[PDB]
Amino acid sequence: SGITPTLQNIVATVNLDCRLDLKTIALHARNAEYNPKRFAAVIMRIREPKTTALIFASGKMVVTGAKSEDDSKLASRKYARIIQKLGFNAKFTDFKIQNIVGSCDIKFPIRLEGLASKHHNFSSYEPELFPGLIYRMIKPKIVLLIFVSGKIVLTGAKVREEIYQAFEMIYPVLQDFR
């Protein structure tokens, strides 16, 4: 049922073996920015699988901006290769997906107050703080941001199948509301 949602952003996490002398990464590589008094990590960027990679001093890495699982893996491998090129003893030891963010445009607008007031146990509405309704599923553990304009963006999925499941489970619900 319904029309499938797209993906917009996949966040993936990698643990590098070695401690990083993080300032030297900013000093040596142009595609990198480091401001410890604002944020604690060096935000590398790479062009071909267009992504940004937060590289923390502990060796953790968070890669963002890819739109496919294999694309995110490839980008993270390239970032590990870059950190190995700067001279650190960096290894692609681990890789986990942590959030796949889906998005879709449903044609009809949403009677948002109906969803806010009929469903109780998993719905919350905050009109001025954030214009969308916050829907918190239980079985797939996906949070859906539902907007009056019919925009729905899904987050917290570990794999795309959960995104599709959540959308086809919420579609026959909000179909009852305009």
Binding site: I43, L54, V62, T64, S103, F130, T155
Partner: peptide
Amino acid sequence: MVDIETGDVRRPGKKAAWL
């Protein structure tokens, strides 16, 4: 579509690492 990358939460008021 706006979420905190380092940890999933609705509605960030500030996008620290990319401000």
